[PDB]
Design a protein around this ligand. Sequence first.
Ligand SMILES: C[C@@H]1[C@H]2[C@H](O[C@@H]3O[C@H](CO)[C@@H](O)[C@H](O)[C@H]3O)OC=C(C(=O)O)[C@H]2C[C@@H]1O
Ligand SMILES: Nc1ncnc2c1ncn2[C@@H]1O[C@H](CSCC[C@H](N)C(=O)O)[C@@H](O)[C@H]1O
Ligand SMILES: Nc1ncnc2c1ncn2[C@@H]1O[C@H](CSCC[C@H](N)C(=O)O)[C@@H](O)[C@H]1O
Lengths: 358, 356
Amino acid sequence: VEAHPMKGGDDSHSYSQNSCYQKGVIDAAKAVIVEAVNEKLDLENNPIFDPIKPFRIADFGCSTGPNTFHAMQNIVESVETKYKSLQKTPEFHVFFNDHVNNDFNVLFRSLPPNREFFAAGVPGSFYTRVFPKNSIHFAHCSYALHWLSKVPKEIQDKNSLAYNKGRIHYTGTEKHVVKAYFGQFQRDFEGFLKARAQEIVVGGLMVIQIPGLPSGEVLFSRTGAGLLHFLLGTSLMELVNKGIINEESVDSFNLPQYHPSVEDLEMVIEMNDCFTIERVGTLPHPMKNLPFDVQRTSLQVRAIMECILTEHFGENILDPLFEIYTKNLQENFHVFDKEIRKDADLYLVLKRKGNLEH
Amino acid sequence: AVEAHPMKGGDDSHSYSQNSCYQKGVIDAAKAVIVEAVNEKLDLENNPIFDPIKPFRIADFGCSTGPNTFHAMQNIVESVETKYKSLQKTPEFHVFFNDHVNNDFNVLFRSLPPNREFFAAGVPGSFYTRVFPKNSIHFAHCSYALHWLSKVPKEIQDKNSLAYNKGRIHYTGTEKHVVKAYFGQFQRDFEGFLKARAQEIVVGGLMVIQIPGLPSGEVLFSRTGAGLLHFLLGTSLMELVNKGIINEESVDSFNLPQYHPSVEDLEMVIEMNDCFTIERVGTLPHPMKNLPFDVQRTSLQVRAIMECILTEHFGENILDPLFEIYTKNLQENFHVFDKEIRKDADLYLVLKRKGN
Ligand SMILES: C[C@@H]1[C@H]2[C@H](O[C@@H]3O[C@H](CO)[C@@H](O)[C@H](O)[C@H]3O)OC=C(C(=O)O)[C@H]2C[C@@H]1O
Ligand SMILES: Nc1ncnc2c1ncn2[C@@H]1O[C@H](CSCC[C@H](N)C(=O)O)[C@@H](O)[C@H]1O
Ligand SMILES: Nc1ncnc2c1ncn2[C@@H]1O[C@H](CSCC[C@H](N)C(=O)O)[C@@H](O)[C@H]1O
């Protein structure tokens, strides 16, 4: 399965309380949800959405909260509002999906007590089927689909054209490595869409928010995620040159992520042919005109990468890794604060096609 | 509201998952009941309510952490699947695992069988409340959970009442005021459970219940294994009082929120609720009936069940001294458990949700 969930407690080092960026994405996304419900959720006279049956909502890659709760409440409230305009009130059933090793204990223990929906947790890779056919009316996936199901094996192979020596991700400049990652993304995202097309009802909506490439931009390294990753690699190599880890440990380490362009996403979706694209765009993120926060960014990265870094390098690498990291962020403060593209959060609104619609 | 006392989490040698073999035997014995219930009472053929275009939805109420809940759910899926095949249908299955919010769903999820043929979801919440949309469950299951009350009866906590449960932590059956208080709480809780389930289960849907109870013809709960295990847990606590390790008031004020009903107790609540018919009822033949009493495993079984509620009231420093004494007392009562106790205390029900 090759699963890497986020740091799962409720304390200072947990995802719950180092996921403020991904929350701003949700906050700006509320408008996206509301507009998609009002313009594209066809409730009226439509037995697919018969309010005598429950309205079922699923979050794919929900993590441990609070972001997933804000997102789900946004959807429940927008949908409940439209039904109200039709003098109906269905029950809501909300499903929280993540990897089997996600901390569902923490999630369940922090469910809003005030909630007006029934809740369930659904353990399993969203690159597989996790629901019966035709059961989901509204699907949501925010900041999860850039995670691949695995590192492309050819970049781990010393003898491959695509061997990713001396780096932990891609920048856009090495043709063979980028091709390997993009190839893996095509397969994973197609598997996601295939599973969702079976699970989502005809006319059902799916909203996706994903770290991507800003339009026109060809170099992932000129995004914020891209430079952060590049510096993580250079920070690891400094631990190498000090002798604290060997060079093989870094050569063999790679991030299982791809950050697609809008054109990349559109290609896979159109080929899959089960969803219509109702809208694509970018999310203006709320913290955009604040100054770059060197310290807090270094913490957000650690809370994301801790497990995968530990599992490969061991616990004892973290504290000295990220003190080097923070240092490299500071030397690059200008770039992060005034040069890098702020607009790399992409969103898509999809609608599941009818069975007689090609 | 909710006073939740889940079983010991994790998957190590002290966990519920490694110390719940007796509860597994109950499910193993009930497999025959499920098969017969499906074959004779689940009206699949040409019934729009069980339209295999939709999934067949199964819920386990009080599932804990595995593996017992997986065995029960596999048994239900296999029997229902078999019957559908005889009608040349092949529905998908959606299996819901319900327990308290503080249950260890992490352990449960991480130990789900890889080769299952059902979609799975965990549902956190007290089963004395609604936890599913109305009219959505086709088959409900509940094994060794419904003897857990929503709370201790207030009467037995009241120093002014003859029901005040001084120097004891449960009932043996000789104290009529205490027994009446627990039975009262049980009618209220079990009624609330049936009410919520009637809203959730489809017309003709089944509910299968296994519960520790009062054996046929028996009046004294202390004549069951559970009853004697509780009696001796009380006396072990009073030994800690005597040794100055806990004060007497802490035992006086502590009580187990449990009631172990007779069949007649169960029938009375079900008849008054009036939403289910009793299709089958009886006592299970437990597969461990003829094995020798195991002192160490039984002590560990009880700790796995009780550690949370004991810790909340007495503090964790009490646990090891308490179960050192408990183990000694189980050993002193070896022959009673081995040969004298009634072992026919596993009751079952097959209920079917009524029309109108
Ligand atoms: C000590 C009892 C335990 C019970 O013990 C069993 O109770 C049955 C019924 O009396 C006996 O036959 C058997 O010997 C004994 O192991 O096993 C399962 C319980 C639970 O799941 O909460 C608890 C309930 C009660 O706390
Ligand atoms: N294949 C997969 N199946 C299920 N969850 C996955 C997954 N790949 C990544 N994830 C999950 O996606 C989450 C990304 S963190 C994002 C969490 C949340 N949606 C938010 O907006 O803040 C993690 O919890 C991770 O475990
Ligand atoms: N009100 C309630 N709501 C949900 N679960 C409850 C409950 N009261 C007790 N339980 C759960 O019921 C379980 C009883 S132990 C039985 C576990 C499992 N059915 C088996 O056969 O082994 C515990 O996990 C306990 O937490």
